[PDB]
């Protein structure tokens, strides 16, 4: 009743939890399928009600005993399934008498013993499954009773070795599976007399050397060994398998494959050798003209024969990824070649004929070579090439002739490729990677639509340097006011009046530092004025040249000198308000200047921290820094500001000189307030950019870096009353 009879009286009773053979079924049924039931044992004459049974499935029950007089009289049985049961051995006595059986499954039974008289009377058996049993050795004598077998699998068993004449009587075997046995040795005649064999699997065994038994297989077509310990493949290994088609030889430590190993193989399709380090000559592939994909990645190939092309007429894929290749013979012919990967070699040039013809060449890859020149029309003859990956080479000039059809171009390396690409040549190019973002800038990115890996990001300006006219005008104003007022303050202080107290000396020195900051801003704005709308051409050499280095040095020197002079002024004011000192203060100022100079020259010779932006300032560090200079400068400046603030507040708590006190207080407040945003934006790229724009970062840095330099002299001139009187008296002196 639980059975679900089909149209052609095919009883299907699976998963019903039965404990015995179903009863009350049609005696004329063909296929019986009791798979997931709990049939522990088969009693005697359990199938007496199914004389015409044709296919019996018992896959899944905890079957552990089959009576000898069970499944008897089933002379029409053809398929028997006993895979996932718990049989500890092949049922030698139970299985006999099935003279019409054509397929037997014994996959998952924990079989460890095979009786010597098993498989008796199976005259026309054609498929055998012994996958997951725990067999120790091949049952040679039991297999001697199956001369009509056509498919044998012993995949997951535990077989140590195959003795001589193991399968001598299997004259009609076709498929042999020995996937995951721990085979370590094969005798010379184990596969003797095993004609008609077409598929041989030895994937995950532990073969030491290359077996010779395959020399006795005259009809082999597919051969596998995936995870053996094979190290050397002697020449002439495959001379006994003229019909061999696929050879699976990977993931094993190959060392030396000889020269003529893959020789005179007519129907071989793909050859893939990786890791054969000791190989130093190209394989003698004469006679193998039907090859379709050839890869020799890891070896020591020194040259490519000129006869590689004009033979293997299909050759849809060529790969040589780790070789000592220096010369590239012309690939004249071989029109079906689609992909070429010649990377990590010693190629030093590409000649005009090197890729002559090459119809349907889609992908070309030379990503690591010592290439320093490319012929003008080296790519003229190319067809529908969609990928040309030429990176990490010593390129100086990249020809573009015959490259209109390119779909993706890579030039990640080639730091010497200062030339700017012409976007006219590449019409339908979609993705491009270039050594510098200024090359991409000519392609109208971020606006037919082309993607670039190095983004301009408004930090390497494709347009004018400063950007908005508001920023340009305010930076010009900052430069003008800083330069003029610092010059005026210096002329008033150091020239006319002979009074030289420590406070006046520090004021003059900080005005000098602000003057240097102003002249840095002035050269920056002069560069921007010169490069109006065409900043890409100027910036392609500004960062590389010494102008960026000298401007960055001036900026960092000015900033550090100003900070150090402010700190020294705070210390001097503290000492003066506490209650000869000229010499020590002067030498301290000299030490501060030398420290600023060495801090400025540190990135000039060390690590090349400049050239990160046209602003040539390592402090904003728009790109991710090495945290060797930026963080050190940030912490040093923060510590100096904290010390100055603590000193100022201590002296204010403790308390003519009030004018100097308030002047220094205003100076400290202005410098700290205007330095805070620069320090904030210094580490902004390092942290996740939650609504953080590189454009606004550049804007803030550009507007706030010279602001203290533009602001200090104005405050000094306008506010200090006694120093204004000094200005008046010195003006009278110079007029007189």
């Amino acid at each position: 009743a639980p059975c679900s009879c089909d149209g052609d009286r095919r009883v299907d009773c699976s998963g019903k939890g039965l404990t015995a053979v179903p009863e009350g079924l049609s005696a004329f049924t063909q296929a019986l399928d009791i798979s997931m039931n709990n049939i522990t044992q088969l009693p005697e004459d359990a199938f007496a009600n199914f004389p015409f049974l044709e296919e019996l499935q018992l896959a899944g029950n905890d079957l552990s005993f089959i009576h000898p007089k069970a499944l008897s009289g089933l002379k029409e049985l053809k398929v028997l399934t006993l895979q996932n049961n718990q049989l500890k051995t092949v049922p030698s006595e139970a299985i006999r008498g099935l003279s019409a059986l054509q397929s037997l499954r014994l996959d998952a039974n924990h079989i460890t013993s095979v009786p010597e008289d098993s498989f008796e009377g199976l005259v026309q058996l054609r498929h055998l499954w012994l996958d997951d049993n725990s067999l120790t050795e091949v049952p040679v004598h039991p297999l001697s009773n199956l001369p009509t077998l056509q498919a044998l699998t012993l995949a997951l068993n535990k077989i140590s070795s195959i003795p001589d004449f193991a399968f001598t009587n299997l004259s009609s075997l076709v498929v042999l599976h020995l996937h995951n046995n721990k085979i370590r040795s094969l005798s010379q005649h184990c596969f003797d007399g095993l004609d008609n064999l077409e598929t041989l699997d030895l994937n995950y065994n532990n073969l030491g050397e290359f077996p010779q038994a395959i020399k006795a297989l005259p009809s082999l077509k597919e051969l596998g060994f995936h995870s053996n310990s094979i190290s050397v493949i002697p020449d002439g290994a495959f001379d006994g398998n003229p019909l061999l088609r696929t050879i699976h030889l990977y993931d094993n430590p190959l060392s030396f494959v000889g020269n003529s190993a893959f020789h005179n193989l007519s129907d071989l399709h793909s050859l893939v050798i990786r890791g054969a380090s000791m190989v130093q000559q190209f394989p003698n592939l004469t006679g193998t003209v039907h090859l379709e994909s050839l890869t020799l990645t890891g070896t020591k190939i020194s040259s490519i024969p000129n006869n590689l092309c004009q033979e293997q007429k299909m050759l849809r894929t060529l790969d040589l990824s780790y070789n000592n290749i220096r010369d590239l013979p012309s690939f004249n012919g071989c029109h079906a070649l689609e992909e070429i990967s010649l990377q990590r070699n010693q190629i030093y040039q590409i000649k005009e004929g090197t890729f002559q013809g090459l119809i349907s060449l889609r992908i070309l890859d030379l990503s690591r070579n010592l290439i320093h020149e490319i012929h003008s029309r080296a790519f003229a003859t190319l067809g529908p090439i969609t990928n040309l990956d030429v990176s990490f080479n010593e390129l100086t000039s990249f020809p573009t002739e015959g490259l209109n059809g390119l779909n993706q171009l890579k030039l990640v390396g080639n730091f010497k490729l200062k030339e700017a690409l012409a976007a006219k040549d590449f019409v339908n190019l979609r993705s491009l990677s270039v050594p510098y973002a200024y090359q991409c800038c000519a392609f109208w990115g971020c606006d037919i639509i082309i993607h670039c890996t190095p983004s301009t990001g408004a930090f390497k300006p494709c347009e004018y340097l400063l950007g908005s006219w508001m920023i340009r005008l305010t930076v010009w104003f900052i430069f003008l006011v800083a330069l003029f007022f610092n010059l005026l303050v210096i002329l008033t202080t150091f020239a006319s009046c002979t009074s030289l107290p420590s406070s006046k000396l520090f004021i003059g020195l900080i005005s000098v530092s602000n003057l240097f900051m102003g002249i840095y801003t002035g050269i920056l704005t002069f560069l921007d004025a010169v490069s109006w709308g065409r900043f890409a051409e100027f910036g392609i050499w500004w960062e590389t040249g010494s102008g960026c280095k000298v401007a960055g040095f001036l900026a960092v020197f000015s900033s550090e000198s100003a900070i150090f002079l402010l700190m020294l002024a705070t210390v001097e004011r503290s000492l003066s308000a506490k209650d000869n000192h000229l010499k020590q203060f002067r030498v301290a100022a000299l030490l501060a200047f030398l420290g600023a100079t060495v801090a400025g020259c540190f990135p000039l010779f060390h690590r090349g921290e400049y050239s990160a932006s046209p602003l040539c300032l390592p402090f904003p560090t728009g790109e991710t820094p090495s945290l060797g200079f930026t963080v050190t400068l940030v912490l040093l400046n923060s510590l100096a500001f904290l010390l100055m603030a603590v000193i100022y507040t201590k002296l204010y708590c403790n308390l003519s000189q009030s004018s100097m006190i308030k002047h220094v207080a205003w100076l400290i407040f202005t410098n700290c307030i205007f330095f805070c945003p620069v320090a904030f934006f210094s580490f902004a790229p390092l942290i996740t950019a939650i609504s953080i724009s590189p454009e606004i970062m550049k804007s803030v840095t550009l507007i706030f870096f010279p602001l203290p330099a533009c602001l200090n002299p104005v405050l000094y001139v306008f506010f200090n009353p006694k120093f204004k009187e000094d200005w008046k008296l010195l003006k009278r002196r110079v007029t007189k």
Partner: nanobody
Amino acid sequence: SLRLSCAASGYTYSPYCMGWFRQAPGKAREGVATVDLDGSTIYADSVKGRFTISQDNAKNTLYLQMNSLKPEDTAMYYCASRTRAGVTCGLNWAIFSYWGQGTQVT
């Protein structure tokens, strides 16, 4: 302590590789003691020493004498035999052709 006697009805010549098997409910039939044509005897290791098996070819009957029984040996016992060309020892249930009715021992 007790003795199980097995009698064979069919008789052509000296039967080959007699044996005794034990089955706990809901599992396989393991072998406990077996003999062969020339009288060599193979015992199960877990039952080695205690049980003894003797065949009488005059009446072609098996006898299994069991002593010092333990509660885990409670199971159903069967008497199995074959006739032809058996080289493997009798501990394997597949090689046997004739199986007895089997009794229950507790």
